[PDB]
């Protein structure tokens, strides 16, 4: 039983908690209750291997940024989430990767870029631009919708695969 | 604002509460909706246990103050805490977690400010994620000290300069003052200084753009 420790990071309101619960409880949380920190275990089969997913739902608010140093050392893969309707949540991805590579003191950390809320008609972040970012940082880019469950499973499973390649 | 940790069978949930007057039932309600996504009661009902007292159900109508605790176990009524996977010993203790989560929260400290390395003045030092304020506490034979407010973005460092005994410790506060760096020294008991130094350092690892220039100069 291999255990992968996953961490969902990103700016506030981009849907980190909604994606996590969509993976766990398979339904959409319409309320926006800001996260302090939450952990979830899920058992899943990925590419023929049954895996124990340790999921960490972190805070998008900077008031709780002092927690980031603890959860960034222990985590193995990081799900960097922005919302396609929030341009700065996309720009804030730069800060989140820099902190991850700084705390982990490594240049090659399992990571996946996730553009959430792809169901909305108010897109402001280019898929060319987001794809270009992920290519520049050498990580896969997935678009997701916690409302329609689009690519929710793919986003988490890809990060597990990125963790698995790393070892 | 106050924080409690709810431990469940599949993980932990950190919950923010307004105050200790909140009922344990409301805390239960928030934890279940967070753990399960929905407020739906579902077939199994849930109970809250004080972390120190296993297998015992908390009075849901009691206040959070009644419980002299900040960590609770969320357990289904049909099951036991021992059937879960969480309630781990690798997790950071709750008091430290509350300290990290409360860094931006305003808190004032009575400390002594050192001037010219030979004099002291009793000041009350208000610290928050917004600003650090230095104010006197309680005229022909006394001039009061000019009130000083330092915006958090101007702060560069807050370090423990010296620690001699639990009743004596000195820390240094560096900040940007019109393209020049001023240094402030304060003295208090070791416990008070350690809390202040740690509180500001949490704030510093939340902001940027002037500390890096200070560290580049160093
Ligand atoms: N239309 C739509 N709304 C979404 C989607 N994902 C999340 N939301 C909504 O966006 C809001 C914020 O979601 P939430 O998961 O709480 O965000 P977060 O990133 O966890 N916030 P925080 O960092 O404060 O914890 C909620 O109202 C939620 O319903 C999505 O894919 N589509
Ligand atoms: Mg959240």
Q: Does A61 touch chain B (CB under 8 A)?
A: no
Nearest to A83 by CA among A123, A140, A110: A123
Is-contact A10 A17, C-beta < 8 A?
Answer: no
The answer to whether the Cβ–Cβ distance between B104 and A21 falls below 8 Å is no
User: Which DSSP helix (H) or strand (E) runs through A132?
Assistant: helix A127-137
In angstroms, the CA B38 to CA B46 distance is: 14
CA angle B29/B35/B38 to nearest 5° reads: 65
| Contact call for B34 and A70, based on CB within 8 A | no
According to DSSP, the β-strands at A49-58 and A2-10 are: parallel
CA distances from A164 to A3, A46, A47, A51, A111 (A): 11, 11, 11, 11, 11
Closest CA to B184 of B132, B129, B109, B144: B132
Q: At what angle do helices B94-101 and B190-204 cross, to 10 degrees?
A: 60
Maximum pairwise Cα distance, chain A:
42
B73 - beta bridge partners?
Answer: B7, B49
Between the CA of residue B180 and those of A139, B147, B156, B217, what are the distances in Å?
42, 20, 11, 12
Query: Quick one: three-class SS letters along B127-171?
Result: ECCCEEEEEECCCCCCCCCCCEEEEHHHEEEEEEEEEEECCEEEE
Q: What is the CATH number of the domain that holds A53?
A: 3.40.50.300
Mutation site for B-interface testing, chosen from A39, A70, A71 by largest number of B Cβ within 10 Å: A39
- Best mutation site among B6, B9, B30, B37 for testing chain A: the one with the most A CBs within 10 Å? B37
A39 vs B11: CB contact, 8 Å cut-off?
Answer: yes
User: Residue B110: what are its φ and ψ, rounded to 5°?
Assistant: -90, 110
Q: After which residues is chain A broken (C to N over 2.5 A)?
A: none
Partner-chain contact B101 A36, CB within 8 Å:
yes
Q: Which residue minimizes the CA distance to atom 12 of ligand 1?
A: A13
Q: How many other CB atoms are there within 10 angstroms of residue B87's CB atom?
A: 19
Spatial CA neighbour of A23 closest among A93, A86, A81: A81
Q: List the single residue in B with minimal CA-CA distance to A69.
A: B205
Q: Give the residue, by CA position, lying nearest to ligand 1 atom 16.
A: A32
Taking the CA of residue B142 and the nearest CA in chain A, the distance in Å comes to: 40
> Is beta strand B71-76 parallel, antiparallel or unpaired with respect to A77-83?
unpaired
B116 is in an annotated binding site: yes
Tell me the residue ranges of DSSP E strands in chain B.
Answer: 2-8, 11-17, 46-50, 71-76, 107-115, 119-127, 131-136, 148-151, 155-165, 168-176, 181-188
Taking 3-state DSSP, the helix, strand and coil percentages for chain B, each rounded to the nearest 5, stand at 20, 40, 40
Put simply, the answer to whether A66 touches B38 (Cβ < 8 Å) is no
Angle at A79 between CA A76 and CA A84, to 5 degrees: 170
Q: In this structure, which ligand is nearest to the CA of A19?
A: 1
Q: How many CB atoms lie within 10 A of CB A14?
A: 27
Q: Ligand 1, residues A7, A19, A28, A32: which to mutate, most atoms within 8 A of Cβ? A: A32
Question: Is the Cβ of A137 closer than 8 Å to some Cβ of chain B?
Answer: no
Structural domain boundaries, residue A40: 2-166
For the Cβ of A67 lying below 6 angstroms from any atom of ligand 1, the answer is no
Is B140 annotated among the ligand-binding residues? no
Q: Entry resolution in angstroms? A: 2.3
User: What's the domain count of chain A?
Assistant: 1
Verify whether the Cβ–Cβ distance A38 to B14 is below 8 Å: yes
Residue B1: Cβ within 10 Å count: 11
By C-alpha distance, which of B49, B9, B42, B52 is closest to B28?
A: B49
The SS3 of residue B210 is: coil
Neighbours of A149 (CB within 10 A): 16
Nearest atom in ligand 1 to the alpha carbon of residue A35 is 25
In the structure, ligand 2 is a single-atom ion and the residues with CB under 5 Å from it are: A 16-17, 35
Nearest by Cα to A66 from B16, B171, B91, B205: B205
Question: What percent of the residues of chain A are helix, what percent strand, and what percent coil, each to the nearest 5?
Answer: 40, 30, 35
d(CA B176, CA B135): 19
Residue A76 backbone phi and psi in degrees, to 5 = -100, -40
Alpha-carbon distance B16 to nearest alpha carbon in chain A (angstroms)? 8
Check residue B18 and report its DSSP letter. S
Interface of A with B in 9-48 (CB under 8 A): 21, 24-25, 27, 29, 33, 36-42
Contacts of B86 in chain A (CB under 8 A): 39, 41
Is-contact B49 B73, C-beta < 8 A?
Answer: yes
Which sign, positive or negative, has the C-alpha torsion B205, B209, B214, B216? positive
Burial (Cβ within 10 Å: 0-12, 13-18, ≥19) of residue B18 = exposed
State phi, psi for A161 to the nearest 5 degrees.
-65, -40
């Amino acid at each position: 039983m291999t255990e992968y420790k996953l961490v969902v990071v990103g700016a506030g309101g981009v849907g980190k908690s909604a994606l996590t619960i969509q993976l766990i409880a398979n339904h959409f949380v319409d309320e926006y209750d800001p996260t302090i920190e939450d952990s979830y275990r899920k058992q899943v089969v990925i590419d023929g291997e049954t895996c124990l997913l340790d999921i960490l739902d972190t805070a998008g608010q900077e008031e709780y940024s002092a927690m980031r140093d603890q959860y960034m050392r222990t985590g193995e893969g990081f799900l960097c989430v922005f919302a396609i309707n929030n341009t700065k949540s996309f720009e804030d991805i730069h800060h989140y990767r820099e902190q991850i590579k700084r705390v982990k003191d490594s240049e090659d950390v399992p990571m996946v870029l996730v553009g959430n809320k792809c169901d909305l008609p108010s897109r402001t972040v280019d898929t060319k631009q987001a794809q270009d970012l992920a290519r520049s940082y050498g990580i896969p880019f997935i678009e997701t919708s916690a409302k329609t469950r689009q690519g929710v499973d793919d986003a988490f499973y890809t990060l597990v695969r990125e963790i698995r390649k790393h070892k | 604002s106050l924080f409690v940790r709810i431990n469940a069978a599949h993980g932990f949930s950190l919950i923010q509460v307004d105050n200790t007057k909140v009922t344990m039932k409301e805390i239960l309600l928030k934890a279940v909706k967070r753990r399960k996504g929905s407020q739906k009661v579902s077939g199994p009902q849930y109970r809250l246990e004080k972390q120190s007292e296993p297998n015992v159900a908390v009075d849901l109508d009691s206040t959070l103050e009644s419980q002299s605790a900040w960590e609770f176990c969320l357990v289904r009524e049909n099951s036991s805490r021992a059937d879960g996977v969480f309630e781990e010993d690798s997790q950071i203790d709750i008091a430290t977690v509350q300290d990290m989560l409360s860094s931006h929260h305003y808190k004032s400290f009575k400390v002594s400010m050192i001037h010219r390395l030979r004099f002291t003045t009793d000041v009350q030092l208000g610290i928050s994620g917004d600003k650090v304020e230095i104010d006197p506490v309680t005229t022909k034979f006394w001039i009061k000290q000019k009130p000083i407010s330092i915006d958090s973005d101007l702060l560069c460092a807050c370090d423990l300069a010296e620690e001699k005994s639990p009743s004596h410790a000195i820390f240094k506060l560096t900040y940007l003052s019109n393209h020049d760096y001023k240094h402030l020294y304060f003295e208090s008991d070791a416990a008070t200084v350690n809390e202040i130094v740690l509180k500001v350092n949490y704030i510093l690892e939340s902001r940027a753009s002037t500390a890096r220039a200070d560290y580049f100069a160093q």
